[PDB]
Write a protein that binds this ligand. Structure first.
Ligand SMILES: Cc1cc2nc3c(=O)[nH]c(=O)nc-3n(C[C@H](O)[C@H](O)[C@H](O)COP(=O)(O)OP(=O)(O)OC[C@H]3O[C@@H](n4cnc5c(N)ncnc54)[C@H](O)[C@@H]3O)c2cc1C
Length: 295
């Protein structure tokens, strides 16, 4: 049922870049690109919450061919144009400190992707992943806790739920539940897909809540920069109340180490009703209602 490994690294699908557009507005930190690829000529199918591999050119420092890097799929199964012909990614250019042999270091695959030109051919593998899948139940509640490019799978869910063209293409999925995105980025220019997220909240105010944690523009009650963990703490009681519903799913995506402050906040909330969150959460994971993808 769920598509997986239609293409593998030994015989990847050769896609073509259609577009490569910037998502970080002026005044933002770093580069994050929305890249769309042409899937025509092959049979790559996928669903929301999955990833694909990209094999970049070149050799590593030891002379060995570069291996694939995984990227969360940014588009619904139908692609951004709802034509079942494309797939999109949301790729940050990795760049980091001097300490590691040199000065500014640039990631191999992410630099390749963020600078790729339309018309270029790329090696694609996958799709992969069954741990970030969206329920078919149109009355589910969906909590989405995203940091940075952790937004990516959330885009696939929200587009499927709320885009006019998606609703028209998906007669069996007319979302009537409640979804809540808490999205942590450093600046307003760094709010990936800001305009479309706010368009969704305006059209569906009873079915979608949008909460930002903007670290360079907002301070938590303790005086520190505002992070996703601070917003979860601020709304811990209400998030816990939603989580108790048998039909609620929670999705967490972003940098590794983001889970710890989220668990601390929810643990304090659940403890007020005599529940140990770590135990309750284990049961949610087993039931397929607690979805995590961090790296
Ligand atoms: C399932 C999954 C989904 C993913 N989804 C996305 C996504 O949607 N968007 C996205 O942009 N990325 C995503 N990634 C990350 C992606 O796979 C790559 O790891 C990322 O793009 C960097 O790869 P690169 O080839 O550019 O860097 P590489 O050339 O592979 O360099 C990475 C290496 O640099 C070093 N390094 C990294 N940071 C530092 C630091 N701060 N200080 C010192 N050394 C450091 C580490 O040793 C690391 O192994 C995802 C990863 C996984 C596993």
């Amino acid at each position: 049922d769920v598509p997986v490994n239609l293409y593998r690294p030994n015989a990847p699908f050769i896609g073509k870049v259609i577009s490569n557009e910037p998502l970080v507005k002026e005044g933002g930190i770093g580069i994050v690109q929305h890249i769309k690829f042409d899937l025509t000529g092959g049979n790559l199918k996928y669903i929301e919450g999955q990833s694909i591999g990209i094999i970049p050119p070149g050799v590593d420092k030891n002379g060995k061919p570069e291996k694939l890097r995984l990227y969360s799929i940014a588009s619904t199964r139908h692609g951004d144009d709802v034509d079942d012909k494309t797939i999109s990614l949301c790729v940050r250019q990795l760049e980091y400190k001097h300490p590691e042999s040199g000065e500014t270091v640039y990631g191999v695959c992410s630099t390749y992707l963020t600078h790729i030109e339309p018309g270029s051919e790329v090696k694609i593998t996958g799709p992969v992943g069954k741990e970030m899948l969206l329920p078919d139940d149109p009355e589910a509640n969906v909590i989405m806790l995203a940091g940075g490019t952790g937004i990516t799978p959330m885009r696939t869910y929200l587009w499927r739920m709320f885009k006019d063209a998606e609703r028209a293409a998906n007669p069996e999925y007319q979302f009537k539940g409640f979804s809540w995105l808490v999205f942590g980025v450093p600046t307003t220019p760094n709010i990936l897909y800001k305009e479309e997220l706010e368009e969704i909240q305006q059209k569906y105010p009873d079915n979608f809540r949008l909460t930002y944690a903007i670290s360079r523009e907002q301070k938590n009650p303790q005086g520190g920069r505002m992070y996703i963990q601070d917003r979860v703490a601020e709304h811990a009681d209400e998030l816990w109340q939603l989580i108790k519903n048998q039909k609620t799913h929670t999705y967490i995506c972003g940098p590794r180490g983001m889970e710890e402050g989220i668990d601390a906040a929810l643990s304090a909330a659940a403890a007020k009703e005599g529940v140990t969150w770590s135990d309750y959460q284990k049961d949610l994971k087993k039931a397929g209602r607690w979805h995590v993808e961090t790296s």
